[PDB]
Ligand SMILES: O=c1[nH]c2cc(C(F)(F)F)c(N3CCOCC3)cc2n(CP(=O)(O)O)c1=O
Ligand SMILES: O=c1[nH]c2cc(C(F)(F)F)c(N3CCOCC3)cc2n(CP(=O)(O)O)c1=O
């Protein structure tokens with residue numbers, strides 16, 4: 001056996017039902033609706049000074065224009081064409097932005113690398129790791145003359161909270177409650193008994 | 197009878213110094229250096245802190261030394277294993293070792309973090325020149341399509357501009373050209389708009405995926421050239437008096453700037469200077485000793501960093517009074533310690549191994565967040581502006597038609 | 600001072616130093632040490648390096 | 652007078668164009684010749700720059716403790732100053748007496 005890592009088991013992390021709309025915040029998703037109503041009413045207003053752009057027809061055109069599809073009708077006056085052009089530019093930017101940020105989400109999530117060895121845990125500093133208070137594992141690290149091992153010991157010697165655990169039952173509990181923050185360093189056989 | 201100083205990384209008191217104080221208790225870089233000198237030169241030294249708490253300087257009228265020079269010229273102490281900026285007046289009164297560490301006047305700036313995304317940021321993925329070329333390409337294609345359709349179909353200027361704008365924004369075109377020369381223009385503009393929109397989307401995805409942070413200032417020459425960021429020293433000291441007695445082109449500018457500038461850039465103490473750099477987001481740059489800067493950027497909260505090389509080089513020695521038989525027993529020890537790779541090992545350990553933060557871990561720190569309204573609102577403003585303008589021109593046309 | 604196909608990146612790893620050496624136990628030891636220290640204080644060694 | 656010992660070919664000491672036209676120390680000038688002009692005015696001596704012959708900095712040969720080149724020209728009393736880039740080393744220090752670094 002040997003000294004072995006122990007980390008919280010990664011959960012399945014089921015995605016939300018409406019997770020497709022994460023790449024844009026909730027404020028954006030509602031100001032889109034409110035700007036759509038505003039545009040559909042202004043286009044009616046401008047067309048109706050005194051054709052086909054009633055209010056229902058105008059809401060249909062503006063919906064079509066947001067979804068990049070576009071309808072059979074199109075404004076045929078200068079002051080309706082201005083509204084059309086500006087709403088077109090806005091929807092182009094918003095849709096391009098949604099796709100770009102979704103690609104960013106997927107790309108970043110794909111390059112995820114869990115802490116797999118001791119070297120990776122040594123370089124990384126986001127997760128605190130703690131041995132038992134008094135035992136052969138702590139004395140190992142104190143007497144350790146390996147740079148990576150000494151790097152951990154230098155870290156474990158001083159920490160704002162006590163990374164050390166008094167009891168191995170406490171050590172298991174600390175990792176479970178820390179939700180990935182605590183990484184116990186116990187013997188391999190006990191580790192394989194606990195995870196099983 | 198070795199002296200020392202209270203500087204935190206160099207000679208420090210352990211936790212509960214009251215419980216344990218003295219030779220076997222004191223810690224610090226100079227402490228371990230003294231121990232290694234003993235290992236190379238066995239001697240009976242008792243560690244005594246400097247009484248005055250500061251380094252040497254001779255009052256003009258008094259003409260007496262004090263601190264680590266007063267404790268050595270007057271036989272009050274044996275040597276001084278501590279940071280002495282070796283210099284002319286101190287060397288005329290003490291015998292100095294070969295410099296066991298070299299340094300300079302570093303530049304200290306706050307670590308650059310991502311700014312608040314300003315409005316009109318949606319047009320960052322493409323350079324300004326490309327946006328201008330897009331505008332004038334649209335206005336050139338529309339007029340050419342008009343001319344073509346009016347050599348040999350309606351496609352007047354007002355309707356051709358609408359067709360081109362519709363084709364760019366990927367929204368379906370109302371009408372399509374029927375001639376051949378009217379169709380070549382349509383095909384070319386379709387290809388162009390497809391490539392441009394694909395480029396914008398792809399580059400924006402690159403912007404959001406991996407982020408690069410650039411230091412606003414790189415070196416002291418560019419810092420003098422910029423002058424948008426205010427840079428200040430300590431009030432009075434070597435790092436301050438250097439700029440007055442400097443005749444290099446850049447340094448005279450960097451002095452005559454801070455010589456006459458409001459408010460007071462000069463800081464009372466280094467703690468206040470680092471606090472001011474941390475407070476002001478990017479407007480303050482601090483010019484301190486290189487070692488102090490390197491040490492500070494390692495401590496919590498690790499919110500600062502050192503940029504640029506050292507402006508002028510100095511050295512720290514191990515002072516020893518002129519007549520001492522220990523005078524030549526320290527030069528050789530220092531040179532051997534330097535050559536063995538032991539002094540560098542010491543500095544490395546006590547500055548990076550005792551590091552509150554590490555650069556080699558979490559350097560990427562990759563995290564992606566939902567795109568807030570702040571990023572986008574620059575297009576909501578344009579949308580509402582366009583609507584207001586449309587209503588305005590509608591009333592203008594109405595009032596014109598009515599008369 | 601050579602065609603810029605190469606560049607220096609990163610800080611130097613170790614430390615060294617050049618000194619205007621004098622023969623052991625000679626009469627030009629102290630004045631030369633003073634001359635070098637005073638030159639470095641006034642930047643006459645930084646004006647020269649920036650030149651060549 | 653005093654005799655100086657400089658190494659060559661570097662950025663430090665170079666031979667001027669029309670070296671044959673010029674004579675004495677002026678026949679070759681460089682950074683460490685300009686330096687070894689300033690030190691004169693603070694130690695007040697008139698020298699004549701003399702390039703080392705062997706063209707090596709110096710090390711005691713393993714077989715025979717003979718110091719070569721620029722430090723050798725000092726140890727054996729052949730010439731006095733060493734106004735040239737001699738790295739400050741322990742082995743050279745135990746034999747010869749340096750100054751404080753003029754460059755790091
Ligand atoms: O011999 C000197 N050695 C010095 C060593 C240090 C440091 F190394 F940092 F400990 C400092 N500090 C600079 C800022 O950080 C805290 C104190 C000042 C020194 N001064 C005073 P100066 O003349 O103003 O440089 C000397 O005189
Ligand atoms: O005292 C010394 N002075 C030296 C001066 C120089 C330089 F001035 F830069 F020429 C150099 N070079 C840098 C590397 O490329 C070749 C020349 C080395 C030196 N060495 C080490 P070595 O001569 O390589 O054994 C010394 O020990």
Ligand SMILES: CCCCCCCCCCCCCC
Nearest residue numbers: 085086087088089090316578
């Ligand atoms: C469909 C036409 C839309 C026109 C949008 C014009 C954008 C103007 C933004 C200028 C900001 C310049 C900041 C330096």
